[PDB]
RNA sequence: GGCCAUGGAAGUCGGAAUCCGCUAAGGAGUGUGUAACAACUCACCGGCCGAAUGAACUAGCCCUGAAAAUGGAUGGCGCUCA
């Protein structure tokens, strides 16, 4: 269960340079504990900076602008495999930008066996245009005047034993 | 990229051999040797151009430039199936003496 | 990938009428009637018109899709045997040993008696399946007709001929013998 | 060796290549002759002959 | 003696075949992969050998 | 029926070659077939339908690779959208 959090920080002011540039980014993480962990994570992999030497500006979270509208997202990927590293692009359905990335952690770890220490989540854009769609699994959800059933239904019953023959109607 | 080049090489000499005679008919033929074929030209050594190709990009190739040469626009519906062309300017009994001649058949 | 939906459409000619009730279709047509169970596959029926059956896999997987083109294909082969019929010819292929091909009736059972292939004393039996039409043809010199509404008996009666003549100890490259299917086509000729 | 008569057997063989202008013909036995290979103007040919090919000195014969 | 009609006949089931080089088996001429599960649906095939 | 080898080899035994000409199309030929041709088949280009297709690579689970001696051990039962 994550959340999507603005980390700003900056070196910390030297009288050389006093006003140092702020670099934001953003960070999908559980908790502000790990959200301001994983921006020094990323910071000292681009930039001369370390925990010791910066200074964490502003943590935020950045709620979904539109929380009820169902939209596609294309997410740009950099993970580790057991024998090299490798970029990847896939594509979720998902009403939040929050639980798309939650779709994708749970979709390397199983497709991939990816853990979450292996995996650089590179872009998350949502795909305005119906053309900008790549991937057929997502595409499928697009096409005009969707239906389908949910054949073989089977129910959850609270108690052992039932007195009627089963069904799997609906 | 040689196909475009091709495409491109049979398209100009399409329209070089349609400005520099004029009129052609139908020119429809099925299980024609390729010695068959010879035979015509053989004989119709500058009377007649046995222009030879294919049908897909002979219709849009044209169709598109139906602006440098229109005229032709509707005349497009009639190439159906294995058609060829003959580019001459004769008479309707002048090309088929030469053209309809050698007939090759079978039970 | 599991796609969301995938279709097939049956066509049905004007004198066929297709007959399907939980996963059992009954086909029937002038030269009679075929009826196939379907029930281990999941697939769900639409009736389009008397014409034409939607045939339908909902989010279904590589393999569940792969077995929905192949319930169109029997119950096609199914209209097509109740309109047109079907008809294996076969040929006696021998270099030196002439094969002595009889149909015989033991105990009430239709067979084919095969006998001197390659020069053997033992005398080959191959049950009739019921449905099937055995006839030596006499427009041709060895050559047995096996003929019948259902596609797959035809067939199986005639790979059942054609594996009781197999070469044992030979090349059988050189030694070629045996008794092979030569045309597979219908009763009614198009 | 041409010795001015390789046109000579194109039209002695005048029968043979039904190409574009009599010259064609010429090329039929300037390809066949070579799969030999001699002293063609001191070489193998499909090289003299792809020297007129492209254009080389002048053989336009009427 | 067969007839040359009849021999392309009896061929058709005796000698147009492809052979798995690992495990021998009898495939179809045009098969990709063994379709044996012991070989682990190999792609090193050759074909049937001929009399010559 | 290209040359030379060859009893013969013409594309389909074997060697220099691997070209040209017409072609939109065609190899001095991918095979079956001939003593040899012929024959048909393919290479490539056509007509037809009409929206996708081919190749190489990466790594997840599964399979092959994977042979030892009393009967037997994911601890046992058993478990397959577990
Ligand atoms: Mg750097
Ligand atoms: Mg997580
Ligand atoms: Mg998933
Ligand atoms: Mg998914
Ligand atoms: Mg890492
Ligand atoms: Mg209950
Ligand atoms: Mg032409
Ligand atoms: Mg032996
Ligand atoms: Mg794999
Ligand atoms: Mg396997
Ligand atoms: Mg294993
Ligand atoms: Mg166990
Ligand atoms: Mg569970
Ligand atoms: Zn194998």
Same mark, same amino acid.
């Given at each position: 269960?994550?959340?999507?959090?603005?980390?700003?920080?900056?070196?910390?002011?030297?009288?050389?340079?006093?006003?140092?540039?702020?670099?934001?980014?953003?960070?999908?993480?559980?908790?502000?504990?790990?959200?301001?962990?994983?921006?020094?994570?990323?910071?000292?992999?681009?930039?001369?900076?370390?925990?010791?030497?910066?200074?964490?500006?502003?943590?935020?979270?950045?709620?979904?602008?539109?929380?009820?509208?169902?939209?596609?997202?294309?997410?740009?990927?950099?993970?580790?495999?057991?024998?090299?590293?490798?970029?990847?692009?896939?594509?979720?359905?998902?009403?939040?930008?929050?639980?798309?990335?939650?779709?994708?952690?749970?979709?390397?770890?199983?497709?991939?066996?990816?853990?979450?220490?292996?995996?650089?989540?590179?872009?998350?854009?949502?795909?305005?245009?119906?053309?900008?769609?790549?991937?057929?699994?997502?595409?499928?959800?697009?096409?005009?005047?969707?239906?389908?059933?949910?054949?073989?239904?089977?129910?959850?019953?609270?108690?052992?034993?039932?007195?009627?023959?089963?069904?799997?109607?609906? | 990229?040689?196909?475009?080049?091709?495409?491109?090489?049979?398209?100009?000499?399409?329209?070089?051999?349609?400005?520099?005679?004029?009129?052609?008919?139908?020119?429809?033929?099925?299980?024609?040797?390729?010695?068959?074929?010879?035979?015509?030209?053989?004989?119709?050594?500058?009377?007649?151009?046995?222009?030879?190709?294919?049908?897909?990009?002979?219709?849009?190739?044209?169709?598109?430039?139906?602006?440098?040469?229109?005229?032709?626009?509707?005349?497009?519906?009639?190439?159906?199936?294995?058609?060829?062309?003959?580019?001459?300017?004769?008479?309707?009994?002048?090309?088929?003496?030469?053209?309809?001649?050698?007939?090759?058949?079978?039970? | 990938?599991?796609?969301?939906?995938?279709?097939?459409?049956?066509?049905?000619?004007?004198?066929?009428?297709?007959?399907?009730?939980?996963?059992?279709?009954?086909?029937?047509?002038?030269?009679?009637?075929?009826?196939?169970?379907?029930?281990?596959?999941?697939?769900?029926?639409?009736?389009?018109?008397?014409?034409?059956?939607?045939?339908?896999?909902?989010?279904?997987?590589?393999?569940?899709?792969?077995?929905?083109?192949?319930?169109?294909?029997?119950?096609?082969?199914?209209?097509?045997?109740?309109?047109?019929?079907?008809?294996?010819?076969?040929?006696?292929?021998?270099?030196?040993?002439?094969?002595?091909?009889?149909?015989?009736?033991?105990?009430?059972?239709?067979?084919?008696?095969?006998?001197?292939?390659?020069?053997?004393?033992?005398?080959?039996?191959?049950?009739?399946?019921?449905?099937?039409?055995?006839?030596?043809?006499?427009?041709?010199?060895?050559?047995?007709?096996?003929?019948?509404?259902?596609?797959?008996?035809?067939?199986?009666?005639?790979?059942?001929?054609?594996?009781?003549?197999?070469?044992?100890?030979?090349?059988?490259?050189?030694?070629?013998?045996?008794?092979?299917?030569?045309?597979?086509?219908?009763?009614?000729?198009? | 060796?041409?010795?001015?008569?390789?046109?000579?057997?194109?039209?002695?063989?005048?029968?043979?290549?039904?190409?574009?202008?009599?010259?064609?013909?010429?090329?039929?036995?300037?390809?066949?002759?070579?799969?030999?290979?001699?002293?063609?103007?001191?070489?193998?040919?499909?090289?003299?002959?792809?020297?007129?090919?492209?254009?080389?000195?002048?053989?336009?014969?009427? | 003696?067969?007839?040359?009609?009849?021999?392309?006949?009896?061929?058709?089931? /005796? !000698?147009? %075949?492809?052979? =798995?080089?690992?495990?021998?088996?009898?495939? @179809?001429?045009?098969?990709? /992969? !063994?379709? %044996?599960?012991? =070989?682990?649906?190999?792609?090193?095939?050759? @074909?049937?050998?001929?009399?010559?």
């Amino acid at each position: 269960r994550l959340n999507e959090y603005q980390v700003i920080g900056r070196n910390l002011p030297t009288e050389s340079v006093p006003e140092p540039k702020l670099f934001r980014m953003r960070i999908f993480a559980p908790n502000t504990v790990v959200a301001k962990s994983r921006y020094w994570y990323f910071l000292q992999k681009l930039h001369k900076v370390k925990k010791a030497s910066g200074e964490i500006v502003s943590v935020n979270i950045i709620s979904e602008a539109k929380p009820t509208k169902v939209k596609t997202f294309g997410i740009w990927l950099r993970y580790e495999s057991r024998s090299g590293i490798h970029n990847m692009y896939k594509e979720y359905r998902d009403v939040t930008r929050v639980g798309a990335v939650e779709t994708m952690y749970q979709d390397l770890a199983a497709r991939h066996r990816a853990r979450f220490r292996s995996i650089h989540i590179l872009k998350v854009v949502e795909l305005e245009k119906t053309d900008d769609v790549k991937r057929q699994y997502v595409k499928q959800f697009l096409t005009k005047d969707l239906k389908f059933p949910l054949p073989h239904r089977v129910q959850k019953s609270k108690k052992l034993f039932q007195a009627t023959a089963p069904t799997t109607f609906y | 990229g040689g196909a475009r080049e091709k495409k491109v090489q049979y398209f100009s000499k399409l329209r070089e051999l349609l400005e520099e005679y004029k009129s052609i008919f139908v020119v429809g033929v099925d299980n024609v040797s390729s010695q068959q074929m010879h035979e015509i030209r053989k004989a119709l050594r500058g009377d007649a151009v046995v222009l030879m190709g294919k049908n897909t990009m002979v219709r849009r190739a044209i169709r598109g430039f139906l602006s440098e040469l229109p005229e032709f626009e509707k005349l497009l519906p009639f190439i159906k199936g294995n058609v060829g062309f003959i580019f001459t300017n004769g008479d309707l009994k002048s090309i088929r003496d030469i053209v309809v001649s050698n007939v090759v058949a079978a039970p | 990938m599991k796609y969301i939906q995938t279709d097939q459409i049956l066509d049905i000619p004007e004198g066929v009428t297709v007959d399907i009730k939980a996963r059992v279709v009954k086909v029937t047509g002038p030269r009679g009637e075929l009826t196939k169970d379907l029930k281990h596959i999941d697939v769900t029926f639409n009736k389009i018109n008397n014409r034409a059956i939607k045939i339908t896999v909902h989010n279904g997987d590589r393999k569940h899709v792969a077995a929905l083109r192949t319930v169109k294909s029997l119950i096609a082969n199914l209209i097509t045997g109740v309109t047109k019929g079907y008809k294996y010819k076969m040929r006696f292929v021998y270099a030196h040993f002439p094969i002595n091909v009889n149909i015989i009736k033991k105990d009430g059972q239709d067979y084919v008696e095969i006998r001197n292939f390659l020069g053997e004393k033992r005398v080959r039996e191959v049950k009739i399946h019921e449905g099937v039409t055995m006839e030596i043809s006499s427009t041709q010199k060895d050559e047995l007709i096996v003929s019948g509404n259902s596609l797959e008996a035809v067939s199986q009666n005639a790979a059942d001929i054609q594996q009781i003549c197999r070469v044992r100890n030979k090349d059988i490259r050189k030694f070629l013998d045996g008794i092979y299917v030569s045309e597979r086509g219908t009763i009614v000729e198009e | 060796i041409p010795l001015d008569e390789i046109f000579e057997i194109a039209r002695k063989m005048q029968h043979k290549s039904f190409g574009k202008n009599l010259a064609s013909v010429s090329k039929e036995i300037l390809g066949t002759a070579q799969s030999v290979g001699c002293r063609v103007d001191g070489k193998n040919p499909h090289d003299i002959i792809d020297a007129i090919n492209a254009g080389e000195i002048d053989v336009p014969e009427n | 003696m067969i007839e040359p009609s009849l021999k392309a006949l009896a061929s058709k089931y /005796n !000698c147009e %075949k492809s052979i =798995c080089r690992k495990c021998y088996a009898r495939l @179809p001429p045009r098969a990709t /992969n !063994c379709r %044996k599960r012991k =070989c682990g649906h190999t792609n090193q095939l050759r @074909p049937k050998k001929k009399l010559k």
